[PDB]
Structure formats: structure tokens, C-alpha cells
Amino acid sequence: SIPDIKLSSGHLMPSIGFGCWKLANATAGEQVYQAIKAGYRLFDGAEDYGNEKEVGDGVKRAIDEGLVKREEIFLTSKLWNNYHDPKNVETALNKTLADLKVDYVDLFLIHFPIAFKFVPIEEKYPPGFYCGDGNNFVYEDVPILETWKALEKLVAAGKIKSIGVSNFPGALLLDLLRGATIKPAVLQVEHHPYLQQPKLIEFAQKAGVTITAYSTLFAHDTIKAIAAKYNKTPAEVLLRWAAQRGIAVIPKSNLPERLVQNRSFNTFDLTKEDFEEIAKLDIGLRFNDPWDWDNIPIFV
Amino acid sequence: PDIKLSSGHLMPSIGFGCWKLANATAGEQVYQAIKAGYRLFDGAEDYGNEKEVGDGVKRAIDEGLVKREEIFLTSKLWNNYHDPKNVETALNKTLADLKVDYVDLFLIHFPIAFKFVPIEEKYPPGFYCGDGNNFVYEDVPILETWKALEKLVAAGKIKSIGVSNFPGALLLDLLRGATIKPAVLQVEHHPYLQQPKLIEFAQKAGVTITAYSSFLFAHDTIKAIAAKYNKTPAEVLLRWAAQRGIAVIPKSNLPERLVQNRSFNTFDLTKEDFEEIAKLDIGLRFNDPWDWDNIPIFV
């Protein structure tokens, strides 16, 4: 029921995954386990989410019980900002693998094109905005390609199956494509009716990169109207709006009951007119902006 | 008023733009510009008149009006020349046309790498990439092109280096790997495309901004402020940039307004004048590579 997208690495990736972002440590295990029972196969996690250990727990139970084999599960994790220096990339990956309790992750993304000063795992984990000096932000002069080459080496070592990037604007993705031997397979970005960035999506897809979207639009008349038109929920329309254009999604909800719903929404088609209508909602509203952290010019 | 670049070299805050300077009148106009007080000339390989600009400079120098070291010459490395091995080739062509041993500033014109085209085949190449009307690109990361530039600065062929049309994330990444930090960021800048966050970032990172608006004089806001201080709307636009520490290239310097475009710092804009002009920023970009071949520089 869940369509797969074949990445440039040659590996298949579920077009619909279960977001681990903000999953409470106390229940993350259960929630992941149940998600797997509800049929979810891809789990979008990250070092910064601070719950990879618990996510590994859920996966391990499912596997120990025989519900799935490791090779039927797609694990995505992301390299946090403090670990961009080549000598630390593997340190962060090992922490992720040991928490997840697996020998390799299916997808490892550069979480942000931002290099915070390295912070030892035992000093603070996940470090978040901490850069080893009170509340001050401290950076490292580590170009993106240096971090990328480190990741390419980890793919060769068999610890990561596919690599990609998150929150990369077009000019940066373009330059990376110029120096990468293993092309970034995925571009994960904030994506929704108020931040459509149609030119970025188009350029990435034509370059072979697969797009994954993360993140009231439920009350908006355009969405409500189109939902009513197909007798679908507004959430269903938003997910199909992306799915239909070949974009993988990580449903923002997934409240126990909504599990099965949020993964079987591909039962209708939006038309050209529908797409043009939704396109008018694009106001360039970006909720996840590093400019707000420390005036980091990623999106300016 | 000169601006001291991060490289230590002084750069005039008001330059003479060579963009679209017709070949038949470039030499003469550059010359008259020098007699009118201009010392900086913003040129580029893509402009296709570097040889004539050189003519104007030589004349003025031979007439003892100015000496080479009093003239600040800017040029830009076009897109088909990013491959490290072709960088000095292009710079040499620039130096020969300008008839000088070095350029004061050499900028990466665009963060775009076209397939190399021999200078004898087509110069300037423009959008031609050696395959009819097709655009063809090379896998040359910005930093590789940059290191090549750094070599030429050590060789003494370039005084200062910088970049043109680089969005924030790209300049930031270049700053991470650069040994010689880009001294200048030249971007499209005017009341409709203010990009205050970019400007603020570059300025705080010590990079000097140079504004061009090549691609308002009748605007209610500009007219009022202008009519208020009894200046031309142009003197107002130039002052608006200059007072915020931004270098500018007057876009016309019509023989009549030649002197006028280099002597507009006779009044100050107020906090309110800035607030009124700030209201015009609608993110309208006129020089966009997305229109050439869907190049994602600003997306």
C-alpha cells in the first residue's frame, strides 16, 4: 500500500514514514513498535531528537518478535551540527548506531548546513545549540564537502546505505553536486502550502535528488474545499498534494488512531486546477529558520 | 571616501560602471570619467569592452592625469572559466585587454560553472557552452575556483578577490574554506530587493558590499525624500546605499550627471527616511539565473 521511491543510491525508500521528532522518551519505544504493527516501515529520526535509543528499542522488539527483519525497516538519522568536522562525523554516527542498535542506517542526512563547534558526547548529548561555551554559539570552519567526503567514506565502510542533506537551499545543493562522488540521494526540507519553494523542488528532482517533506492549513478554505470535493480530510489532501508530485512525507500527526489513516491517503487524484489553487497559498512562510537562532544566513 | 577591504587595500566607495558601456565609446567615456574624478572602474570579461576600458585608462595615464596605482580596476571571472586550470587563462586575457599587470579586484561573477570554451573560439562566451544553444556545466566546486584565485593573488596578478551574486549559505560555506576571505560581495541591490539579512550577515562577517541595480526615480517615496532634500532621486538612491556602508556603481553617469553621481554625500538620510524606503522591499529580483536555464542560485 505504501509506494516506494528508488533513490539514486539504488536503494528503495518508503514514500511515507513515521516521524520520531518530538517523540517522548518514555513512550517512543511503544509508539515505534505499534507504528511497525500499523504497517509503518520508514522511521525518520535524528541525533538532535534525543530519543534514538528508544526508537531502537521499538525496532528491536518488532524484530525480536519476528514482525519484520532489519532489511524491511528503513532507518533515517541525521548528523547534528556539532559533528561536521570529519574526525567527529564517525563519532556521531557510532553514537546513532549504538542507540538504534543496528550495524548501519539506511539514510544519514547532514541535518543543517551549519557547523557548530564540536562537543564531546559525554559532555552533553544531544548538545542542541550548546557549543561548549555557556549559551554562546561557536562555529567551526568546516566546508560542507569536507563533511560529505567523510560520509562517503562511511558508506564505503558499510555503515550507511544512502546519504543526503536537510535544509539545503538551491545554490548550496548545486555546489555539493559538483564535488560529490556519491550524489546526495535525498533533500529533506520544510515543505507545506505556505512554503512551497516550487523552483527548489523542480531543480532537485531533475538532478535525481529525492525530496522528503517535513511539517492553520486545516481551516483554510482552499484546502477545506478541495477536501470536501473528494470527500477526504484536509490532512489527506495535504499528504496527497506532496505524494502525487513524487515527494516522500513524514506525517505531522500519527496519533495512535490516525496511524493507518496517515499512510493510506493515496486513494484520489488532485487536478491541475487543484494544484494551481493550492499554489496560491505559497507565501514563503518558513517556521524552521536558523536566522532566528543566531542570524545564521542559511535562507537569505 | 575609500573603504578599507579585509585585504588591507583601499577601494573607492563610488565607482564607474562598465556594464553595457558600448565598445565604440567605452575608451572615451572611461577617460572623461577619470577627468571627472572617478578612480574605480567596475568591469567584467562578460561585458566585452575590457580592451576599450584599457584604452581609456592608458590615455589618462599617458597624459599624466593619473598613475596606475591611483586607479582601481575591477574585473570578473566569467562562468566558463571556473575550472582551476582555466582561471589564470581568463585572468591573463583580462590583463592583456586592460593593458595592466594586475587587477585590483577580481570577482567570481556567478556561482555557476559553464563548460570551458577556448578564448579563440568565442570571447566573451556569454551563454555559449560549446554546444549550440545548450547549456553545459562542469563539476567545479566554488572552493576549487577560489583556491585558484588565491594562488593568483600570491602571484601578484590580483590585489583583492571577492564574489558576485552569492546567496547567504554559499558565502557562509565559502568563508569556512577560504584562506583569503572574500573581501567583496557584489549583489543586485535597490529599494525593491533590499535583502537586509544578507547585507547584515556579510557586513558583520567583514565582507564589503558593492551594489548594482543595472536591471524608482518616479516613486512617490523616493521623489518625496528627494524633493525633500532637493536632490535627484538618483542622488537619494546612491546616498541610501552609501550611508549604510555599501559601495555603489552609478548606473548611467550621463556626461551631464557624471560629476553629480560622485558627489551626493552632501546630506544625510534620517531614521524615518530609512523606514520609508524600507517599506518598498518586495523581493523583486531582475538578474536571476533561474531565467537562463533554471539555475537554482536564488531558490
Swiss-Prot record, chain B:
GO biological processes: D-xylose catabolic process
Binding positions (substrate): H109
CDD domains according to UniProt: AKR_AKR2B1-10 (cd19113)
Membrane recorded as keyword: no
Residues that hold NAD(+) according to the record: S164, N165, K251, S252, N253, L254, P255, E256, R257, L258, V259, Q260, N261
Protein origin, superkingdom: Eukaryota
InterPro entries cross-referenced by the UniProt entry: AKR, AKR2B1, Aldo/ket_reductase_CS, NADP_OxRdtase_dom, NADP_OxRdtase_dom_sf
Recorded GO MF terms: D-xylose reductase (NADPH) activity
E.C. no: 1.1.1.307
Quaternary data: Homodimer.
Family to which this protein belongs: Belongs to the aldo/keto reductase family.
Annotated function: Reduces D-xylose into xylitol. Has a preference for NADPH, but can also utilize NADH as cosubstrate.
Protein name: NAD(P)H-dependent D-xylose reductase
Gene name linked to the record: XYL1
